[PDB]
């Protein structure tokens, strides 16, 4: 129809999705109302300006932003001086999603830099001379796999890496993030991610890990940082993704998990919140929505007959609308929500989430949903490692040619 | 001694007491990537930190230097490790270090390293006497600070300080009944104390929650808590729940109540209830209402549930293909 609005967030009924505070105001409802009011303005902008809406992913702008950042950053990134391998990964993956080639000059320079970040003891640090840590170790490995050259792969010292992982392993099944460091589910994921890709998983490396992770699932259905803590999309993604790598997703109550994550998508905004009663944030477009492809695979592996064969179990269209209309910075790069400033972290995950929302795939079945101009379609991302599915296959195949350290 | 923000602050390369030390420039290689253009102060402090770390100089001046490096980037875990090495090696007064960490957390409460550092201090001293109060102050500024709640659970659990936490939880639920962190803490306290098996406790909690649901019917936290504390034993195990929820339909409806109804129906069909078919249709009707009208953002989920229920509960579900 001519009166019909193709964009879900601009339809008249959508107005009914606004927050109902039952005339009981608290810090929570107040903060939620502020966001929705700001988001409504964005949605209404076309109408009030008397222009026909057009959702365009600003590829050109994002590319310039990334291309430059990969080489040089302002002092605004002093707070990430201990996370440079992450900057490599976030940027390289964003370029990958945007289908932008990685010049071999760049690739080799990235390899050399990550090599300087590698510890003599194993693992990677946040920068040259810094002690190894599981977070930058995970980012370093992902960056090298995105490059996927023989040179990149050879940077990783597999024997030391495994030794490093063992030095962090705890008796209860958990891992420290680094020597004398903290413990939470992130370490399980970082360890399982780098260990599986580089083929260094021994018979006892992850003993008790699946059980420890399962202990982090709480009454909410989601997973917390440590047993007892509130469920959060970041920790839930780490927990499930790690379990998928260990082939132990079944240790979890997948049904309560599914119900929890699907409830994390905001009815009005379209994007996801990180935990119940908090605010929408573009980076959760991945940490949260990324769980659906994982759950789909797990449920299907159990022979679930009710699983859709064309869509993930979340509003794909609404997520794309939120990201495209509310998370792009006009100067390039993406962000948390309107009012927040861009950064490479959100640029990486907003695009990763957009890709997830555009590409559905369950074995032979394949269905895409690209909101806005067709040029918006991105390269697909692997729901476990968050790098190109082809890069995962390529990397794993390569390392399977090597023998698990110590045989 | 000399604060990083002091108007008379001087770069380390201009300090006499550091003249014997040659700074150590960062080794980024020939053609750097993601190279950060550090400010003068930042690079100067870290060039000297790299020097003391390299020499493993365990001195009072190195100790003071870590305070500045941390101030410039509290997320630098390497500096924190060296600081802890210096705390022990130099036999530093840990209560003084406690005063120090209490101040740093106040200014950067969302940082991982600061909280882990405080935990280590408490462990070393074996003194949790200042924790609940300190955490309470942080939570008074951000009632949902994840690190704060996690540290609070650790302290309470390790030192068995359960006695007043439920009271603390009631206070915050009063302030904001929508604080999911407080509902999580409530479940944390009860689980580790009385447990939810004692019928008097479970009864008390469910009454409290339904009462909170009445006051704020659209508050998703109360609903998730209600479901969370009953779903393990099975929702169908509580026959009056369904009826009572249907009574709130009129003046307290929400996609949350409709969703709960579906969960109850789902468990009933799972424990082969009476009127197998009557319950199924009631459920599929709600699943459709939710997917088409009441909760469309979750249409793909609700259609999945509708399908799942149909798949294993329709009158023809157990009937052979030949029939």
């Amino acid at each position: 129809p001519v009166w019909s609005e193709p964009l879900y967030s601009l339809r008249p009924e959508h107005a009914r999705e606004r927050l109902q505070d039952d005339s009981v105001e608290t810090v929570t409802s107040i903060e939620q109302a502020k966001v929705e009011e700001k988001i409504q303005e964005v949605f209404s902008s076309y109408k009030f300006n008397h222009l026909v809406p057009r959702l365009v992913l600003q590829r050109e702008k994002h590319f310039h932003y990334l291309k430059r950042g990969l080489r040089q950053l302002t002092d605004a990134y002093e707070c990430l001086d201990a996370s440079r391998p992450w900057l490599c990964y976030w940027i390289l993956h964003s370029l990958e999603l945007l289908d932008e080639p990685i010049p071999q000059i760049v690739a080799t320079d990235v390899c050399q830099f990550l090599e300087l970040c590698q510890s003599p003891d194993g693992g990677f640090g946040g920068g040259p001379g810094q002690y190894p840590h599981l977070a930058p170790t995970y980012a370093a490995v992902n960056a090298l796999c995105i490059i996927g050259t023989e040179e990149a792969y050879n940077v990783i010292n597999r024997e030391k890496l495994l030794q490093y992982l063992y030095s962090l392993k705890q008796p209860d099944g958990s891992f420290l993030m680094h020597v004398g460091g903290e413990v939470d589910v992130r370490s399980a994921y970082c360890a399982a991610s780098v260990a599986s890709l580089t083929n260094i998983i021994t018979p006892d490396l992850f003993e008790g890990t699946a059980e420890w992770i399962a202990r982090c699932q709480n009454w909410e259905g989601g997973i917390g940082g440590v047993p007892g803590m509130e469920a959060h999309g970041g920790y839930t993604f780490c927990g499930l993704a790690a379990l998928v790598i260990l082939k132990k997703e079944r240790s979890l109550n997948l049904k309560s998990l599914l119900q929890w994550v699907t409830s994390r998508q905001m009815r009005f905004e379209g994007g996801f919140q990180g935990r119940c009663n908090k605010l929408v944030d573009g980076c959760y477009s991945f940490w949260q929505a990324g769980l659906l492809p994982l759950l789909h695979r797990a449920l299907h592996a159990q022979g679930d007959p009710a699983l859709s064969m064309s869509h993930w179990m979340f509003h794909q269209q609404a997520l794309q609308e939120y990201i495209l209309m509310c998370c792009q910075c006009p100067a390039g790069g993406l962000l948390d929500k309107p009012g927040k400033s861009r950064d490479f972290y959100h640029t990486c995950y907003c695009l990763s989430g957009l890709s997830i929302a555009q590409h559905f795939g369950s074995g032979a079945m394949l269905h895409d949903v690209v909101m806005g101009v067709p040029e918006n379609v991105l390269q697909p991302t692997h729901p476990v490692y968050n790098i190109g599915p082809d890069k995962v296959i390529q990397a794993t195949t390569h390392f399977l040619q090597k023998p698990v350290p110590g045989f | 001694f000399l604060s990083l923000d002091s108007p008379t602050y001087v770069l380390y390369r201009d300090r006499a007491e550091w003249a014997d030390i040659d700074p150590v420039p960062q080794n980024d290689g020939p053609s750097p990537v993601v190279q950060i253009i550090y400010s003068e102060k930042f690079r100067d402090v870290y060039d000297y930190f790299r020097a003391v770390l390299q020499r493993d100089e365990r001195s009072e001046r190195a100790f003071k230097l870590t305070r500045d490096a941390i101030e410039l980037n509290a997320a630098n875990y390497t500096v924190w490790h060296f600081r802890r090495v210096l705390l022990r090696s130099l036999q530093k007064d840990l209560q003084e270090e406690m005063n120090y960490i209490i101040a740093i957390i106040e200014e950067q409460p969302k940082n991982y390293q600061v909280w882990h550092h405080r935990r280590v201090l408490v462990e070393w001293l074996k003194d949790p006497s200042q924790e609940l109060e300190f955490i309470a102050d942080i939570l008074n500024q951000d009632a949902k600070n994840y690190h704060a709640w996690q540290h609070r659970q650790w302290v309470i659990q390790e030192f068995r300080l359960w006695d007043n936490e439920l009271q603390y939880v009631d206070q915050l639920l009063k302030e904001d009944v929508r604080n999911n962190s407080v509902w999580n803490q409530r479940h944390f306290v009860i689980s580790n104390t009385t447990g939810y098996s004692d019928r008097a406790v479970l009864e008390r909690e469910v009454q409290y929650t339904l009462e909170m649901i009445k006051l704020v019917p659209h508050n998703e936290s109360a609903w998730n808590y209600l479901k969370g504390i009953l779903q393990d034993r099975g929702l169908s195990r509580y026959p009056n729940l369904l009826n009572q929820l249907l009574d709130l339909q009129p003046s307290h409806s929400s996609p949350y109540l409709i969703a709960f109804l579906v969960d109850i129906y789902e468990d009933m069909l799972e424990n082969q209830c009476d009127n197998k078919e009557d319950i199924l249709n009631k459920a599929l009707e709600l699943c459709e209402i939710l997917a088409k009208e009441k909760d469309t953002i979750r249409k793909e989920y609700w259609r999945y549930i509708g399908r799942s229920l149909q798949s294993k509960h329709s009158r023809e579900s157990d009937i052979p293909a030949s029939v």
């Binding site: 977070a135 927040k340 | 997320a75």
Partner: peptide, 6 residues
């Protein structure tokens, strides 16, 4: 105003 994850 930014997200901290490590």
């Amino acid at each position: 105003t930014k997200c901290v994850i490590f």
